[PDB]
Amino acid sequence: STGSATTTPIDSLDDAYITPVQIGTPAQTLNLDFDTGSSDLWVFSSDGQTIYTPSKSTTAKLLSGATWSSGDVYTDTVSVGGLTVTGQAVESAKSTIDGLLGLAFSTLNTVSPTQQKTFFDNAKASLDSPVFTADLGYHAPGTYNFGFIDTTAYTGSITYTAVSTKQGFWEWTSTGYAVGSGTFKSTSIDGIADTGTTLLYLPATVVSAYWAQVSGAKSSSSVGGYVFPCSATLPSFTFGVGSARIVIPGDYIDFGPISTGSSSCFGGIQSSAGIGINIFGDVALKAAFVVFNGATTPTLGFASK
Ligand SMILES: O=C(Cc1cccc2ccccc12)O[C@H]1CNC[C@@H]1OC(=O)Cc1cccc2ccccc12
């Protein structure tokens, strides 16, 4: 089996992406934020959000005694882009985002006392190939595919790189970076591929080197990160995947005025200092076609597009 679903930015800044997901029988369609940095499928259930009502689903069953963290848990039939999983744990929680669909490793799932599997892990027992791909758009819709690689969706070849599952994330090591037309610096940067995080969070050294190339940019403790004059044209940012390179255009790094009408704009590359981990969020991922390979030895692939 395979599935293919369109994912759409929730706003003009690409602050997050929502993907329609069918839950229950008859189907209830909820717009979920696909999050490769967490491992729970949770939904608002029975300020604008569409809710899941398990009492209206003939296939819903309470997963008795199970809670997540806190709310209850049901199992039900869940379909994404034509791909159906029966007995999926759907976690019930109390305005464009109707819930989350976690796609990190199931070891991060929060259900107690019986930990539950992600939609991807459950689907693996049917997929043509144990993979899913993220093809996020810049200020435009994109695609999540399950079970196949669309060879028309990228240019050149896919460079695969090793993944550590020790922390439950799609954790990998970038081989370096460049700012604009500058020289590429070969240096190992460990981080996670996280579709549920908006921005690119990298070590302070790297981030300072980037913003130093933008006249008037500075880190503002008041605002909570790097800001830059809205009048600026931003340089691109390149990250390494093995010997390959992914180029993030400067425009992808512009997150607009810090407050309505302000001439100070918020940067899309920020320091990870304090987070405890580097995060290749949407700003980075949307510059690439990204393969989440869930084979026995998981890996991550990146192609230009
Ligand atoms: O776990 C959740 C689920 C979740 C809960 C509540 C609201 C949410 C809203 C949107 C999406 C997911 C949500 O989201 C995490 C994983 N990916 C999105 C987000 O990470 C970052 O914020 C970033 C972040 C910061 C600090 C520490 C981190 C440690 C590991 C990984 C990410 C970290």
Side-chain angles (χ1 to χ4, degrees), residues 6-46 48-60 62-69 71-93 95-165 167-301:
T6 296
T7 192
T8 304
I10 63 164
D11 61 26
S12 66
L13 298 178
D14 297 350
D15 281 319
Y17 298 76
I18 50 173
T19 310
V21 175
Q22 283 68 50
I23 308 181
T25 309
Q28 303 178 35
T29 298
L30 274 69
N31 297 326
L32 306 185
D33 187 344
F34 283 23
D35 182 9
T36 63
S38 67
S39 303
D40 289 46
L41 196 173
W42 72 257
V43 297
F44 293 113
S45 71
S46 53
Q49 300 85 4
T50 289
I51 65 178
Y52 168 59
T53 304
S55 67
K56 292 181 187 177
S57 174
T58 61
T59 42
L62 179 74
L63 186 62
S64 184
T67 59
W68 57 294
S69 58
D72 289 332
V73 183
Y74 293 82
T75 59
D76 209 338
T77 301
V78 172
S79 298
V80 175
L83 168 68
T84 301
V85 166
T86 57
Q88 173 67 43
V90 177
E91 304 170 31
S92 160
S95 61
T96 56
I97 300 167
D98 298 326
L100 296 185
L101 192 147
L103 294 166
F105 294 91
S106 294
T107 50
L108 291 180
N109 176 267
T110 76
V111 176
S112 175
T114 309
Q115 192 172 52
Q116 299 294 302
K117 290 164 60 181
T118 67
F119 174 83
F120 179 49
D121 270 351
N122 282 326
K124 275 183 192 176
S126 73
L127 294 177
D128 289 357
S129 183
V131 302
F132 69 89
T133 65
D135 181 9
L136 303 179
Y138 166 68
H139 296 175
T143 303
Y144 280 102
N145 291 330
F146 292 81
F148 73 103
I149 303 306
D150 181 357
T151 57
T152 75
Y154 61 89
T155 64
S157 59
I158 306 176
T159 302
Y160 287 88
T161 194
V163 163
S164 172
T165 61
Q167 300 193 100
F169 301 117
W170 294 91
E171 187 172 3
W172 64 290
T173 302
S174 170
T175 48
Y177 72 99
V179 177
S181 62
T183 311
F184 184 88
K185 184 178 190 201
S186 292
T187 188
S188 293
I189 305 171
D190 296 341
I192 66 169
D194 186 358
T195 58
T197 290
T198 313
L199 306 182
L200 173 55
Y201 295 88
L202 292 175
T205 47
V206 176
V207 175
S208 181
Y210 177 81
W211 290 108
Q213 294 306 310
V214 180
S215 296
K218 70 182 198 307
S219 181
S220 165
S221 54
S222 309
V223 176
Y226 282 89
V227 296
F228 67 93
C230 290
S231 57
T233 305
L234 298 178
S236 61
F237 183 89
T238 300
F239 66 93
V241 183
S243 62
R245 310 286 179 252
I246 298 295
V247 181
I248 305 172
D251 289 344
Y252 291 26
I253 298 159
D254 178 11
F255 280 73
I258 58 171
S259 301
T260 309
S262 175
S263 66
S264 289
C265 279
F266 196 67
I269 295 176
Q270 296 293 345
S271 178
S272 64
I275 303 183
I277 201 161
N278 300 307
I279 305 172
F280 292 84
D282 296 336
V283 162
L285 304 181
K286 75 178 82 167
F289 176 88
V290 186
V291 180
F292 294 79
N293 171 28
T296 306
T297 301
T299 64
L300 201 60

